[PDB]
């Protein structure tokens, strides 16, 4: 426990969970909606995927 010739700095990164609040002003984005689609695929021996 002798002090060496040189000194040192120690750096670390820390994570903090945080519950945030988001405000949005009215009419800030225009959205265009499309018609939904349904297709089928992966026809396999016992099942179908949609």
């Amino acid at each position: 426990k002798i002090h060496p010739g040189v000194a040192m700095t120690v750096v670390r990164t820390d994570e903090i969970l945080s519950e945030n609040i988001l405000f949005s002003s009215r009419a800030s984005t225009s959205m265009f909606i499309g018609t939904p689609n349904v297709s089928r695929r992966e026809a396999r021996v016992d099942a179908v995927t949609f």
Partner: protein
Amino acid sequence: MKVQGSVDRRRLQRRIAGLLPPPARRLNISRGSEFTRDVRGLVEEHAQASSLSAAAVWRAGLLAPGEVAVAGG
């Protein structure tokens, strides 16, 4: 003036209307209905099983020309 040599006129259209249709995919959905004959017709998997009758078999279509059982005659 109307010679009409080939038989394609007024006749081949019926043949190609049968040879025409492909199987359906990408059927569009409405929220409020949520279930239709359209979705069912896309869904139906069309199994192959015998009811052991003349009318029942012909309706099930097991006497199918291709390898797969097809109904509707």
